[PDB]
Structure 1
Amino acid sequence: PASSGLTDETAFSCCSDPDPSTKDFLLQQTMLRIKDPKKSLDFYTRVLGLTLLQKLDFPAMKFSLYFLAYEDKNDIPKDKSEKTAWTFSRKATLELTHNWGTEDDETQSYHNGNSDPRGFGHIGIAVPDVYSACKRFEELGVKFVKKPDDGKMKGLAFIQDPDGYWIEILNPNKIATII
């Protein structure tokens, strides 16, 4: 029997109610390696409107971590120790990992997971209006993987960040209409 995927029945049959030990777990971060934080920080804050919660430097291992999320900057504790506990307890953050030097190495680039070898596909952002968001993205020179009305999924877009990671742009209140 050629795979026709799971029925809803099988799928949900594979699903267990959370064990009480897992009751306070949260999905805290998605980590992506970045070649050049100057570009990545600009894109994510200025184009997408995230806020840089914290920059952590690790001299012993020659990398930095940049945590970005949709949070009000006024909410960030100034104190380093308090900043840390707050940042790592936010939901839905991006951890951008910068291995020092990569920005100056012409031979280096990271792989976005969407060609051989595939794996990771993208992160995704819900917006109140995909068409207006993308017109703005266009005016800002953002590279598109899929414009909102190209292809057969109309009203859905994919853009790329400076490393070429894909970012889905969607309106959650209009997805059902395109299945």
Structure 2
Amino acid sequence: MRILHSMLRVADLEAALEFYTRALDMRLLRRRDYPEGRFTLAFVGYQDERAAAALELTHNWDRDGYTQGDGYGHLAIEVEDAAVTCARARALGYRVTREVIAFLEDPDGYKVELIQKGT
């Protein structure tokens, strides 16, 4: 058995993909529209889904935002240098909650934990 992915609902799919690709160097693994269900999915990550865990992003066409709650914690990502990742995210105008570990917020306010490689 293996963990395949976490799924997060996003108010704006392209806004979410722009963050994961620019701030986090992720690649779009697959993307599909479901008019029958009025939703779109995008899988993003680093390796192909057959090799590693990915992040699934869902946008429901009939929604403009979601209730977050305080149950969901964060997504942790291993990075080469947390300070460079942080500085780049701030340069792109993204919220850096705390700044070797650091925390980013995606456009929907989901927290991303940056864990510098070799910790």
Q: What TM-score do you get using the length of structure 1 for normalisation?
A: 0.61
The structure with the largest strand share of the pair is 2
- Equivalences for 1:1-179 in 2 at 5 Å? 25-71=1-47, 87=49, 89-102=50-63, 108-113=64-69, 118-146=70-98, 148=99, 155-174=100-119
Distance in 2 (CA, whole Å) between partners of 1:121 and 1:112 is 10
Distance in 2 (CA, whole Å) between partners of 1:41 and 1:28 is 19
- The CA deviation at 1:58 is 1.5
Structure 1: 4+ residue segments shifted above 6 A: none
Larger RCO: 1 or 2 (CA < 8 Å, sep 6+): 2
Distance in 1 (CA, whole Å) between partners of 2:51 and 2:6 is 12
Unaligned runs of at least 5 residues, structure 2 = none
Distance in 1 (CA, whole Å) between partners of 2:95 and 2:74 is 15
Q: What TM-score do you get using the length of structure 2 for normalisation?
A: 0.89
Q: Is the 8 A contact 1:112 1:166 kept in 2?
A: no
Q: Secondary structure at the match of 2:113?
A: strand
| Structure having the higher Rg | 1
Q: Secondary structure at the match of 2:36?
A: helix
- The CA deviation at 1:144 is 1.6
Change beyond 3 A, Cα 1:59–1:90: farther
Unaligned runs of at least 5 residues, structure 1 = 1-24, 72-85, 103-107, 149-154, 175-179
Aligned residues: 119
